[PDB]
Design an enzyme around this catalytic site. Sequence first.
Site, short mmCIF file in Angstrom:
data_model
loop_
_atom_site.label_atom_id
_atom_site.label_comp_id
_atom_site.label_asym_id
_atom_site.label_seq_id
_atom_site.Cartn_x
_atom_site.Cartn_y
_atom_site.Cartn_z
CG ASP A 7 -6.31 -7.01 -1.41
OD1 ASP A 7 -5.71 -6.11 -2.03
OD2 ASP A 7 -6.03 -8.20 -1.62
CG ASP A 105 -2.32 -3.89 -2.01
OD1 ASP A 105 -1.38 -4.56 -1.52
OD2 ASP A 105 -3.00 -4.30 -2.96
CD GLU A 106 -2.06 -8.15 1.33
OE1 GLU A 106 -0.83 -7.99 1.34
OE2 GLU A 106 -2.58 -9.28 1.35
C1 TMP Z 1 4.30 -9.22 -9.18
C2 TMP Z 1 3.81 -8.12 -8.27
C3 TMP Z 1 2.55 -8.20 -7.70
N1 TMP Z 1 2.09 -7.22 -6.87
C4 TMP Z 1 0.73 -7.36 -6.32
C5 TMP Z 1 0.43 -8.77 -5.82
C6 TMP Z 1 -0.69 -9.38 -6.67
O1 TMP Z 1 -0.23 -10.14 -7.81
C7 TMP Z 1 -1.32 -8.13 -7.20
C8 TMP Z 1 -2.27 -7.75 -6.11
O2 TMP Z 1 -2.42 -6.35 -6.20
P1 TMP Z 1 -3.58 -5.72 -7.08
O3 TMP Z 1 -4.49 -6.87 -7.46
O4 TMP Z 1 -4.08 -4.72 -6.07
O5 TMP Z 1 -2.87 -5.06 -8.24
O6 TMP Z 1 -0.28 -7.14 -7.33
C9 TMP Z 1 2.93 -6.10 -6.58
O7 TMP Z 1 2.56 -5.18 -5.82
N2 TMP Z 1 4.18 -5.99 -7.09
C10 TMP Z 1 4.66 -6.95 -7.93
O8 TMP Z 1 5.80 -6.84 -8.42
CA CA Z 2 -4.79 -5.33 -3.99
#
Ligand code: TMP
Ligand code: CA
EC number: 2.7.7.7
Length: 341
Positions: A7, A105-106
């Site tokens: 992640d 990202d996963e």
């Molecule tokens: C709300 C939202 C969350 N995310 C992701 C899901 C998690 O809330 C958070 C996880 O990614 P991160 O912690 O790597 O930034 O961001 C998006 O990519 N797009 C979105 O619009």
């Molecule tokens: Ca992430």
Amino acid sequence: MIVLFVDFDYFYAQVEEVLNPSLKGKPVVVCVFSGRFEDSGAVATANYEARKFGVKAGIPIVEAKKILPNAVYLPMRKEVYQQVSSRIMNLLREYSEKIEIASIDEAYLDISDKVRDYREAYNLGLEIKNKILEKEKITVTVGISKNKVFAKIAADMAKPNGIKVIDDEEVKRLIRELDIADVPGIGNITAEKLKKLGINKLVDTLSIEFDKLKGMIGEAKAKYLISLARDEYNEPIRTRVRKSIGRIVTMKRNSRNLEEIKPYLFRAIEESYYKLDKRIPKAIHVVAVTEDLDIVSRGRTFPHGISKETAYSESVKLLQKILEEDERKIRRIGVRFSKFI
DNA sequence: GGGACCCTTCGAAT
DNA sequence: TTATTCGAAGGGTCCC
Ligand SMILES: Cc1cn([C@@H]2C[C@H](O)[C@@H](COP(=O)(O)O)O2)c(=O)[nH]c1=O
Ligand SMILES: [Ca+2]
Ligand SMILES: [Ca+2]
């Protein structure tokens, strides 16, 4: 089975930091600006320096700025983050044949045939972390365990810039001790539904009557949670195949005028057909988000592939159906294409 | 009784 | 109070 899950940490914000290293140490907020008024829209994500103060994915931009008026606010650049992601996903292919890319990202890697035990898996995780850092300067969190669910839980626990194994005996501990809201796929609505049955932990699913559990949360979620509680979950890592491609856009003002909604719909089709590339869809759905933020959709499966010309005319039909069958003003209009040839 | 779709909504993830 | 994709729930049809 051994699963290594990766992640990427606070991904969009970290890519921004990598491309502008002077942002490191500052709160950085990645925003989807919607253009209806000054700072309308939502936060897509924020780094840990912004999250420290309550600024996080999903909150309105206006609210973020009341909390951290002096943080760095950056427009979302999805295309840039996608190219970085693609490169890092290619790095991960060196470590396994069996890789499931869950999102931007996963990624899940079945490393059963590459490592013998959890120690070797841990070392492979560090190798992976070092490799991404060296090539792309991106930190990621690694979760290692016996299935995809507990590998993800492992990363949720270790993030950011972490690495965590949940061995077979810790899986058993968590079946009893882990709050069930932290299980992947249990959001606010299911978590609350599970609390109203007194279910707080996975283990609690084994004493309730199945029909009762199924009645409240549905057959699949019930079966999912039960298989987890029984330590019998082992969904395979599989290459994901995109099953749909679409585009939805916020209109400058809410409306129920066909002619006024049309150009937005047509832009959505154009962008979607670009993204489809050589893929040919047999299904089309027009999606409207209404003024109170509900989602209403009307679609059609054709017996053959959909040309853009057909998409254009068919989408107008489906939009009229929405307008006809729903009294609400439309805030967002969009299209999704599916059932590919 | 159940396959094989099909349609629209819901809920969850990024 | 964004955008994108996924899977399943229930509603349904028509069909052996
Ligand atoms: C709300 C939202 C969350 N995310 C992701 C899901 C998690 O809330 C958070 C996880 O990614 P991160 O912690 O790597 O930034 O961001 C998006 O990519 N797009 C979105 O619009
Ligand atoms: Ca992430
Ligand atoms: Ca949750």
